[PDB]
Design a binder for these strands. Sequence first.
RNA 1: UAAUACCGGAUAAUAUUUUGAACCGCAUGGUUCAAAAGUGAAAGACGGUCUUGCUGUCACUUAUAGAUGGAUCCGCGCUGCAUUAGCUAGUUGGUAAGGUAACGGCUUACCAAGGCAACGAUGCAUAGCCGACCUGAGAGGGUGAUCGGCCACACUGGAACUGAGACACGGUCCAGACUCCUACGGGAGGCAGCAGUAGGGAAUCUUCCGCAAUGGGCGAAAGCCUGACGGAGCAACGCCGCGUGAGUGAUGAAGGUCUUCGGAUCGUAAAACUCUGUUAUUAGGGAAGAACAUAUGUGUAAGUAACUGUGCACAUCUUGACGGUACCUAAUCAGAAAGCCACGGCUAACUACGUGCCAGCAGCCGCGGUAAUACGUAGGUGGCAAGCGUUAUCCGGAAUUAUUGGGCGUAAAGCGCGCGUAGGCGGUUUUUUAAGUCUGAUGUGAAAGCCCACGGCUCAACCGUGGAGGGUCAUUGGAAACUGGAAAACUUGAGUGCAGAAGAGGAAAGUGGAAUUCCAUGUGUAGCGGUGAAAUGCGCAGAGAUAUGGAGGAACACCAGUGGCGAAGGCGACUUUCUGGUCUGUAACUGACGCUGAUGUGCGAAAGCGUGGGGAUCAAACAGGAUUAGAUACCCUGGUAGUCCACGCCGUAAACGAUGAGUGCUAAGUGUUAGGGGGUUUCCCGCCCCUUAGUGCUGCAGCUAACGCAUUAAGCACUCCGCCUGGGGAGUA
RNA 2: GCCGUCGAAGGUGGGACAAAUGAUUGGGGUGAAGUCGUAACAAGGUAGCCGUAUCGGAAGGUGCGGCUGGAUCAC
Lengths: 135, 131
Amino acid sequence: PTINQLVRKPRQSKIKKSDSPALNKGFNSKKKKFTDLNSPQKRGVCTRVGTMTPRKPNSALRKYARVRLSNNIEINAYIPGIGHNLQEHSVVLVRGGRVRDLPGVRYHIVRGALDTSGVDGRRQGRSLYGTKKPK
Amino acid sequence: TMTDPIADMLTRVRNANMVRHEKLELPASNIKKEIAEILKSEGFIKNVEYVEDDKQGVLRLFLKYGQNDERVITGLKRISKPGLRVYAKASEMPKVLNGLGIALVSTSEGVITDKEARKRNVGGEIIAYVW
RNA sequence: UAAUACCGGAUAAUAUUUUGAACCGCAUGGUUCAAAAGUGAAAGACGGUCUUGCUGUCACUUAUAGAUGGAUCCGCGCUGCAUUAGCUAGUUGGUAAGGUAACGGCUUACCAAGGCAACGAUGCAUAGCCGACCUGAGAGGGUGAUCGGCCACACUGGAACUGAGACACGGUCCAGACUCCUACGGGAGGCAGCAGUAGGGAAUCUUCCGCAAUGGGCGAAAGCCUGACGGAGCAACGCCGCGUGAGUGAUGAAGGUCUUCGGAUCGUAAAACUCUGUUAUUAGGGAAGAACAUAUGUGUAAGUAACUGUGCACAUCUUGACGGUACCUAAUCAGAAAGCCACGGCUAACUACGUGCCAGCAGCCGCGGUAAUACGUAGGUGGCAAGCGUUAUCCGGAAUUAUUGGGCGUAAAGCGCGCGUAGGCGGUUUUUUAAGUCUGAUGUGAAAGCCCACGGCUCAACCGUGGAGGGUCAUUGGAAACUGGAAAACUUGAGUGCAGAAGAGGAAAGUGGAAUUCCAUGUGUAGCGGUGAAAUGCGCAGAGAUAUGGAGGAACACCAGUGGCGAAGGCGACUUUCUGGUCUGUAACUGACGCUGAUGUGCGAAAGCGUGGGGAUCAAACAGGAUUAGAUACCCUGGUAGUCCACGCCGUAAACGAUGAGUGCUAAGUGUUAGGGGGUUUCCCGCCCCUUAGUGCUGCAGCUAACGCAUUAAGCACUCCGCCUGGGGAGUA
RNA sequence: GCCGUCGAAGGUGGGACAAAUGAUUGGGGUGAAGUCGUAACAAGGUAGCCGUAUCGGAAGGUGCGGCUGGAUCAC
């Protein structure tokens, strides 16, 4: 652009929006004040659990669940991983993740530390999967 | 509008560079005359000449190409262009390609080359880069 | 019941108000000298000498200061939103009062209407501020933990007393709640102080100590309190730092691991040897330093009858939460002490196996279908480690702002095209200016961090020390190139000047024409009709058809072309209207008069539509009606809003070259559309060539992913406009 | 001690944004089925832009205007 119009303008960038609406507790539990908390985790419950079916050929049956965290904001979220012992209205920790299974969702639960218990039979959960070192 | 003399001077110089001929003349200014004398000092212009006619006299340049009509210099560009009145003080003097690349700078007394600039240490409005 | 509590009064000045004087500044005025009345007050405390004088030492009061700090004012910076454009009345200014440290609507009464408002007031959201910090080569971007300061707040609102200073984070009053409790009558409280509590949160540290160290408040001091702060205490929360063994020892032990079956394979690994006490374990040192401190007692300058009393630095004494620390020594073994991530690749590391497109893995390509180095397992490897991995975010990347560091020839982008306000930049030459600009000097950039060096801590981490760095700050020294002025002119640009050349340019008006369609008349059938059949629809009284005749309205058969006008929309029947524009040459000469152009803003396909007409077609819808329950679906037949006339609304489109404008440069060949000239010849018109100004085709260079442009650049540059930010979501809300 | 300046706080009334709600209406689709609608030929079919309108429920088409556009695609 010309120098003058460059001056009378900011040349604004194309700054993005976080595709993860991770508005953590912030001021939810006083004044219900919306607050952009970037917490990597909030405690909260999946009030309902479900299971959408994938199409062929990989009929890798993926299971979903609708959850409320500390802010209690509705979202249908899929469960990854093998093995669990939770049910309806069980408290669950959900991490940010978008996978190839189904649109309309951009988060994912984590295994091991809460009602959706992981499995300690593998060795990949040695530092993760919520489960301790397989000893 | 012929906004800047430096710009047209240098674009036509680069045009001659492409076309590989030496004898070219152009309506000057006193500054154009002085910088053409600086050019002949630098050498890559084998000869320069100035006369007077409407309105400023036609400066007459006669380049020193390479042995095979090559640009002895490599690159050339204006610096002080319309709107951009850009000045350089003693330390703000730049060194395009160090000594090889050069640039006259108008200073509180007059237009002086980069060597003169860092030599007498009077800064000024940097004019145009040639390398 | 006392005060250094209170109220008197004596005195008093730079104190008030006036008296005069002198000096001087910016206008207000300031500086100094000589006049009127006015009350200053700790007969205080406490020591001393010793009278209780006397000062001591503070305090007191007074004026003058310095100094401190605060206040107030100004300049420049100081966040996003204009789907944020009017704000605006003590407001604007003054007048008089008051009022405060001052200032003034600061507030009253006056009169007057201001005053701000696109260079974004106002409004909204939001926000503590900056120093500083994170990533980035940097540029930059982002951030604003403690720490430095500055600001705001202290259940809420409204106040005000106090005091130098508070309208008072731990004063008060009231009211509002709130909540608590009461004899129910009314009383009581407010952690955005510090821990901690409850809850909340992913959770964030003692309901720890101390005043050792400083830091105050108050004094002379001890001392008071210190949730400042110091200290230890928790959160591998973050860095840094020790190891979690090394050396030997090959034999490729055994064994895990594959294997083709040998071997490798873990691996100098092992065993075994040799060491280390690092690290940790213990007995100690030190629980360092920090510790200086507080005042006392020592004789020495100021003065006192009397360093009497004092007061100066010295004698000499005094302080540990860390902690009986860090760190260090006697020993302790390789012996406590370490893992984790990955191995398809991307990127470092793979094979065997079980597994079976299934489970699944899954950051990306995608793998896994039985056979996977992509699932799992074992080995083996790698990377890494007191940590590892995941996630949340900022930048690098990301140059993904493109000033540095994008385009718009086509992937995203040129209004549709204008006129032009501000503004943007500014022709040639001559001086001054120094505004800039440059070019130093000054003051001045808290500190720290910041970089550099360096000191300490083993070292590192780390603080410290100094330096450097750090302004776009103000001031002055030059300077006059440049821009900006100031002045002076020059000219081709611009102007305009003369001669011409030049036209679908515009809009108004009129004129014609063939003829959509309709229809007059006359003739004339039998069908027209659309189809697959036709239906229909027209129609035997004449449709379809004809020839004679008109009507209305319509746009105008060729030209027509890269002709042209235009800025585009668009602009072609003819003509005129009264103008707008086109250029050749022209240089006529004031003397830059120029520049694109935010806002604004005119002009403007079609449709549509308001109104008022026309309707000639055409024509949606439509229906008759094929078709088929349905049939408008389409193929019919007719007709149909409107198209068409008047203005508005319409302002939109493929208005597209998605090539903003102007500038001037740059091989060619090679045309055009108007020009001109020269020679060439009878008009060279005939030719050629030079350019004028455009519009070609091929193509130098250049550049584009390619495409191609390429003198008319998409090559080169320049002032000025807008857009574009994946797709699309959605030009849609 | 009273009055008077101001006076929170607080409420009253006129309305404004209003906020979810929403009177009932409207729009739609829908045949389970209550109408009973028949029961013949089932479609003779069509196809290079944009804006804009008039319908088609729409699917598209009549369009008006002027035309830039950038066939198929594999392992």
